[PDB]
Amino acid sequence: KCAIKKDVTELIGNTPMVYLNNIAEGCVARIAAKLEYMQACCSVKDRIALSMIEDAENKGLITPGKTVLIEYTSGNTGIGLAFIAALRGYKLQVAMPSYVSLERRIILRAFGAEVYLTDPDKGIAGIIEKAEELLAKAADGGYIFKQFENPANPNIHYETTGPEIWRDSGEKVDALVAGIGTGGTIAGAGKFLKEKNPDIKLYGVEPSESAVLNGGKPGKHLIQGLGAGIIPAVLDVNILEEVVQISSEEAIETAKLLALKEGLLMGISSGAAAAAAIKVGKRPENAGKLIVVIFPSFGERYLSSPLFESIRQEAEQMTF
Amino acid sequence: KCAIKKDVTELIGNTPMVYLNNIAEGCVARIAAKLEYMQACCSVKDRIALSMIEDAENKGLITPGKTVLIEYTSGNTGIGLAFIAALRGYKLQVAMPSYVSLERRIILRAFGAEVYLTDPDKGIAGIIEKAEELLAKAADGGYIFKQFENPANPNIHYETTGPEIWRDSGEKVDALVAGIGTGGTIAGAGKFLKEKNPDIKLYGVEPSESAVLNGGKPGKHLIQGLGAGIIPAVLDVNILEEVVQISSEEAIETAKLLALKEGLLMGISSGAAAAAAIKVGKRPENAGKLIVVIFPSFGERYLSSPLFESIRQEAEQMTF
Ligand SMILES: [Cl-]
Ligand SMILES: [Cl-]
Ligand code: NA
Ligand code: NA
Secondary structure (H helix, E strand, O other), rough: OOOEEHHHHOOOOOOOHHHHHOOHHHOOOOOEEOOOOOOOOOOHHHHHHHHHHHHHHHHOOOOOOOOOOEOOOOOOHHHHHHHHHHHHHHEEEEEOOOOOOOHHHHHHHHHHEEEEOOOOHHHHHHHHHHHHHHHHHHOOOOOOOOOOOOOOHHHHHHHHHHHHHHHHHHOOOOOEEEEEEHHHHHHHHHHHHHHOOOOOOOEEEEEHHHHHHHHHOOOOOOOOOOOOOOOOOOOOOOHHOOOEEEOHHHHHHHHHHHHHOOOOOOOOHHHHHHHHHHHHOOHHHHHOOEEEEEOOOOOHHOOOOOOHHHHHHHHOOOOO | OOEEEEOOHHHHHOOOEEEEEOOOOHOOOOOOOOEEEOOOOOHHHHHHHHHHHHHHOOOOOOOOOOOEEEEOOOOOOHHHHHHHHHHHHHHHEEEEEEOOOOHHHHHHHOOOEEEEEEHHHHHHHHHHHHHHHHHHHHOOEEEEEOOOOOOHHHHHHHHHHHHHHHHHOOOOOOEEEOOOOOOOOHHHHHHHHHHHOOOEEEEEEEHHHHHHOOOOOOOOOOOOOOOOOOOOOOOOOOOOOOEEOOOHHHHHHHHHHHHHHHOOOOOOOHHHHHHHHHHHHHHHHHOOOOEEEOOOOHHHHHHHOHHHHHHHHHHHHOOO
């Protein structure tokens, strides 16, 4: 009884950290990775799905069996909303670009969510437009979560992710490295950490092919979860020390090294974040410091992605 | 520093339990599920991969960069060995039936393991034969782990899984329900629990189409992870109260209900174990008792399985 969780929502957050060892050869800082796949549905977005649903409930803006929940998503936020909507009795509709993997669409449908695909050429505008169309058709009321502007997104990282890093690092964390998608993680956890110790430095990560935070133009890239092509409303770029640019190729190669050297089967965005943390960790000014890097998800969620393309081809041609 | 794990092997075990709620409507016992996907590579077998490797190391039977590690597996034990072999510098070869999913073969190759497929018509005999062939070809020595007879398999569940259940249940657990594959989980955890409280009852689960523990003949079934068609050497059937028989169909339907009612995307063998626990939990003699049920893995590992067949067909036919 005494440690048994009430339901799946009590399995969100409280994720562990692990040192990076052989992959960090040459670093003069120590690097610890926070493993966001170790929770209810195996990604960081589980935190914001619960936070945004609870916020809407506290305001009476969603009611089970009445309100249609709606979100625009590339997959992980939709999945986070979907398992909680199933548990709590909400109808859920997600708008997603048609390039999202079949695997993530299967997971959404297994939780009973409805999937509406959009034209990839219309970008973020396309999925926001579809979410607005769905809201207009909701006969008994709907609610769009809007994770790029909803304060419950950074706020949950201020309330949980940041405090976990501070406590679990023994208050010794010197820097946070985090890829920026919505920017909620680095905005909320970083705000908390700098309140605890204003010397802590925050490093964003973005694709070098879509380096909008550094003033570049949007462009196509492979780092799923990063590079939305916009500066999200929930992110204040002024608190950042730097936004490190990582190529799709470098992110994929570093993800492969996480599996082969650390035994960690991680996704492309974790590869990008690790590559950035290792670069920062080689700088002489960081000698003896502790760098914490966010790993947002698990590699098993991305087996149809370019991360595994050449392996997939080999395994298809094998027999007994 | 103070809670940061040394490496991925310190992320094995110590998994949480969660109450089952709406899916257990009608039960007069309370049911708590132990979530073995919440660890390093998301299955119960991570425990025995580390235990069997450490045992061989303690005996000097495997040496990194010299010994070829070999195991016969249907996937999860191979994956557990593979991430530790990658971390520690061991070459690993696995023998598997050719029906194992492409997804699990991709994961094995991403960790650098070599995959040797066998004829499914030769059953367990086929994969043991291939492992013996590989051992004969190992020029500098090899080692076959033999999870069906290796005592390090049940012993780790005596040392970790059982103690976790006892402690996390506040010493109130009255019964353990666990599917039997190698039988290591129920043998080791059950042995520990009955030492703590000899009134605790142990319920195995097996497929009704391959009910060998109940005296039936082996047969084809869909409950991946259960129903090896043999009685493994590491299992003493005499400690069991009962082996509950669950059909492939019932296991799949219950797995679907775990996702839709509990928000838990679980695999077919977790569906079978939950179905058995819910049946036992409806018996009047168990009124007021606490039943713990083992959930061995996560449903995302099985998206190409019959559990998702009809959803997969729907999602393939969708456009923007
Ligand atoms: Cl293969
Ligand atoms: Cl779809
Ligand atoms: Na302060
Ligand atoms: Na005793």
